Design a protein around this ligand. Structure first.
Ligand code: SF4
Ligand code: F3S
Length: 106
């Protein structure tokens, strides 16, 4: 399973969803998560995230380990997304800000 981590919060470019062969991504207000039972680890998405937020589960940084379980839990409540859409409005101002998990909306 690939894991979407912090920097996607408040950026949500959705460039990642075009490349996906299965419907692995599930959509929230300002973040996207990958459903771990459905990702087939094709690795195609992580070169596409402008925010460089997608990691192989085995490569999620020490300080971002929360995300592995977050992606699994939210993937069970959030709707599947399959079309790219426009990035959230202020996406570049937040790209690269650390500590964005305090801003996650459900
Ligand atoms: S690695 Fe592939 S199957 Fe997995 S979330 Fe990315 S695009 Fe989807
Ligand atoms: S910022 Fe998020 S919506 Fe996808 S393209 Fe990157 S993981």
């Amino acid at each position: 399973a690939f894991v979407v981590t912090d920097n996607c919060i408040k950026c949500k470019y959705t460039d990642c969803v075009e490349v996906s062969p299965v419907d692995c991504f599930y959509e929230g207000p300002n973040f996207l998560v990958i459903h771990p039972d459905e990702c087939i680890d094709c690795a195609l998405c992580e070169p596409e995230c402008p925010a460089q937020a997608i990691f192989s589960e085995d490569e999620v940084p020490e300080d971002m380990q929360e995300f592995i379980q977050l992606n699994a839990e939210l993937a069970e409540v959030w709707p599947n997304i399959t079309e790219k859409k426009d990035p959230l409005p202020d996406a570049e101002d937040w790209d690269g800000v650390k500590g964005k998990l305090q801003h996650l909306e459900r």
